[PDB]
Amino acid sequence: AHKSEVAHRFKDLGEENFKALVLIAFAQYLQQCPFEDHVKLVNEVTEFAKTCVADESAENCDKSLHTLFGDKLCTVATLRETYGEMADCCAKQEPERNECFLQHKDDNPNLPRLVRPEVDVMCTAFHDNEETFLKKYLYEIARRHPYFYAPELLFFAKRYKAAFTECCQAADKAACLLPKLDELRDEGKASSAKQRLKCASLQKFGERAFKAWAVARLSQRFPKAEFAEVSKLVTDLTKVHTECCHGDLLECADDRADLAKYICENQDSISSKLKECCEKPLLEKSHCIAEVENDEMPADLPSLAADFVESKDVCKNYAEAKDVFLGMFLYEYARRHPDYSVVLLLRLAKTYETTLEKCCAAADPHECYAKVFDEFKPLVEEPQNLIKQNCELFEQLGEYKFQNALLVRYTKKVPQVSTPTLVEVSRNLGKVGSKCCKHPEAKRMPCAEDYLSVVLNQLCVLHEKTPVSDRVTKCCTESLVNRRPCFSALEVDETYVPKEFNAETFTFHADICTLSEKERQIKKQTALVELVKHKPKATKEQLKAVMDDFAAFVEKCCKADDKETCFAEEGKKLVAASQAALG
Ligand SMILES: CCCCCCCCCCCCCCCC(=O)O
Ligand SMILES: CCCCCCCCCCCCCCCC(=O)O
Ligand SMILES: CCCCCCCCCCCCCCCC(=O)O
Numbered sequence: 001a002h003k004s005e006v007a008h009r010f011k012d013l014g015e016e017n018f019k020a021l022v023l024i025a026f027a028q029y030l031q032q033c034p035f036e037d038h039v040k041l042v043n044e045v046t047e048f049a050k051t052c053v054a055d056e057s058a059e060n061c062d063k064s065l066h067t068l069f070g071d072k073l074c075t076v077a078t079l080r081e082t083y084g085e086m087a088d089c090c091a092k093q094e095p096e097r098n099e100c101f102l103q104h105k106d107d108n109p110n111l112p113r114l115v116r117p118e119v120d121v122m123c124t125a126f127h128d129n130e131e132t133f134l135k136k137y138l139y140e141i142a143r144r145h146p147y148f149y150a151p152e153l154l155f156f157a158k159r160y161k162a163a164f165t166e167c168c169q170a171a172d173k174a175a176c177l178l179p180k181l182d183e184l185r186d187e188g189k190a191s192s193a194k195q196r197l198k199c200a201s202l203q204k205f206g207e208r209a210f211k212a213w214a215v216a217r218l219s220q221r222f223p224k225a226e227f228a229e230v231s232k233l234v235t236d237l238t239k240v241h242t243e244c245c246h247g248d249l250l251e252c253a254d255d256r257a258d259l260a261k262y263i264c265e266n267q268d269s270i271s272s273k274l275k276e277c278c279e280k281p282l283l284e285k286s287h288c289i290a291e292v293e294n295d296e297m298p299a300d301l302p303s304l305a306a307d308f309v310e311s312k313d314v315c316k317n318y319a320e321a322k323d324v325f326l327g328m329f330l331y332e333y334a335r336r337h338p339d340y341s342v343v344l345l346l347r348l349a350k351t352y353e354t355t356l357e358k359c360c361a362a363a364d365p366h367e368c369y370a371k372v373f374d375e376f377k378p379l380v381e382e383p384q385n386l387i388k389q390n391c392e393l394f395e396q397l398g399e400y401k402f403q404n405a406l407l408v409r410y411t412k413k414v415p416q417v418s419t420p421t422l423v424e425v426s427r428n429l430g431k432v433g434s435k436c437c438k439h440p441e442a443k444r445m446p447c448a449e450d451y452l453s454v455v456l457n458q459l460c461v462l463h464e465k466t467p468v469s470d471r472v473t474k475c476c477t478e479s480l481v482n483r484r485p486c487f488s489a490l491e492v493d494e495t496y497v498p499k500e501f502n503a504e505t506f507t508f509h510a511d512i513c514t515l516s517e518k519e520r521q522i523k524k525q526t527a528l529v530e531l532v533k534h535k536p537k538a539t540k541e542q543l544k545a546v547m548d549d550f551a552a553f554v555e556k557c558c559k560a561d562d563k564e565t566c567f568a569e570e571g572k573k574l575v576a577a578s579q580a581a582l583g
């Protein structure tokens, strides 16, 4: 507690960081207000912040930040004209005014797609008015993502700024800058997805489920920490995410800072990997800690047999505290297996738990549960075999042809899915192969889990809204621990009725060779989906004949002069012989 809280935040973050976070905070609430407006409110709270720094006993400096924030929100003159119900929050008072404001945040504002400008425009606006360009751009992101944790948006923003500084003075501005922006775009979207997955888990599956996840990951993170230390970090982390899911930025930020400060005070009890994280400023501490790599596990850990199979007090220790015993099992297993995904560890714990629920009520428990560790081999191998098979495929073919292999397989399993959705799922899954199959076997499964979890929640909320399959709803509503296996065991839909032929879908023009490699790829892949949707009985060799003839057709009908006529002349020739090769 401090005499002036807005003073302590200004001194702590610094001016630049303050201005950026104030702009993000208000943009997330006044999503429909113009950029000029937010500039004027930021300058006004920034000047007020400084008077409180100069003298903490100055007027209004003693008020709380939630109160300061709501006060400024309520001095907006148009606020009833454009926000309406939000205006009535101003007639309440603290703390109900604050929670009223949170209720009236609109996750899905009806704002046009933020169009990427031309690289030379952006670089020129960059060079000529760095501030306005960066902040206008930052305002336009924050207003469209109002629930994206504000200091993480600033961490993403500062990387965008580094990409412009490096790339605007480069030889090929475009070749330097588009991969980086695309790189950042996906990452910010993966962060958004991870945040909502965690909240959604907390609300549907409960605290206990969430807690078992955190025990696994935390024990992988800090394998030399003691169970009691990890369990405290589990209880603190749950409180943090419970608060952060609720939406109040300042309360979520204090919970994260408090937890990071606790970790930094107890590095010896936690991990030897946090020294440099722990001398970063408050702004970066919890972010840095959250990204630090696992610590080394202790050298000669014993096997788990002693405590969890061979010991005689198994049923006694379990029954006196089922959750604490299971979490101790989870902690010992997860600290030993940084190569496993969290979900596969949770499967193991769920198998152990099911085993003791029936063994510990039986004639003699120990024979009943003597070989439950055997039941871990199949659960371990299924994911590791999936990674093996698919990383071999990615090297045999390439990203594009691995994406095309997945396109055919997933289109055959669930052909009711939109062609555009099928295209982007299979393409984003080729990119996960590219980044994870490049790790050794010992880090592939954690990497996959991290990215597949983004693709599956993304695909799921598209399903919740415009669903298309009952089997997908089953996969999207089941336990988060089982959601990837459920999708993996989706069988090829043999109930599917083929799609009628449409001659346009498989007719191609000269724009195909006047297109970007991406746009050409998306076009060819869109048609590969439609070929499977019209002929789902086609084999991979029957499809390769059609695909090999297509590629030669476009390499022949774009090296000629009357390319436009070849596309219809020889396009009618390839279509016909394709429909004779199939069906
Ligand atoms: C009247 C001003 C209100 C606006 C202030 C909003 C942002 C203040 C601080 C934001 C987060 C800073 C601390 C981050 C903590 C963490 O994530 O570890
Ligand atoms: C915003 C993404 C992660 C949220 C981080 C919450 C507070 C971080 C403080 C230290 C946490 C260390 C790692 C926690 C995440 C994990 O590995 O399960
Ligand atoms: C039934 C699926 C739910 C999600 C996965 C559950 C696996 C069972 C393991 C429960 C561990 C108990 C929570 C530990 C918290 C603590 O240490 O206090």
Ligand SMILES: CCCCCCCCCCCCCCCC(=O)O
Pocket (backbone or CB within 6 Å): 386, 410, 413, 414, 417, 418, 421, 425, 452, 459, 460, 462, 463, 466, 467, 468, 472, 487, 488
């Ligand atoms: C509206 C979109 C929802 C339906 C989309 C379902 C498409 C299935 C693709 C899921 C990918 C599964 C990831 C791993 C599965 C496997 O190993 O085969």
Ligand SMILES: CCCCCCCCCCCCCCCC(=O)O
Pocket (backbone or CB within 6 Å): 506, 524, 525, 527, 528, 531, 534, 546, 547, 548, 550, 551, 574, 575, 576, 578, 579
């Ligand atoms: C070299 C790029 C990889 C392969 C590109 C895949 C293109 C698949 C679409 C070709 C369909 C041609 C025949 C039409 C279908 C029909 O008539 O039944």
Ligand SMILES: NC(=O)c1cnccn1
Pocket (backbone or CB within 6 Å): 005, 064, 065, 066, 067, 095, 250
């Ligand atoms: N509204 C409050 O009670 C409050 C407390 N601490 C910081 C900010 N706001």
Ligand SMILES: NC(=O)c1cnccn1
Pocket (backbone or CB within 6 Å): 117, 136, 137, 140
């Ligand atoms: N010119 C603009 O208003 C603008 C905004 N955001 C990005 C790019 N340009």
Ligand SMILES: [Cl-]
Pocket (backbone or CB within 6 Å): 117, 121, 125
């Ligand atoms: Cl622009």
Ligand SMILES: [Cl-]
Pocket (backbone or CB within 6 Å): 117, 121, 122, 125, 133
């Ligand atoms: Cl611009």
Ligand SMILES: [Ru+3]
Pocket (backbone or CB within 6 Å): 117, 125
């Ligand atoms: Ru602009």
Ligand SMILES: [Ru+3]
Pocket (backbone or CB within 6 Å): 341, 343, 344, 383, 449, 484, 485
């Ligand atoms: Ru899995």
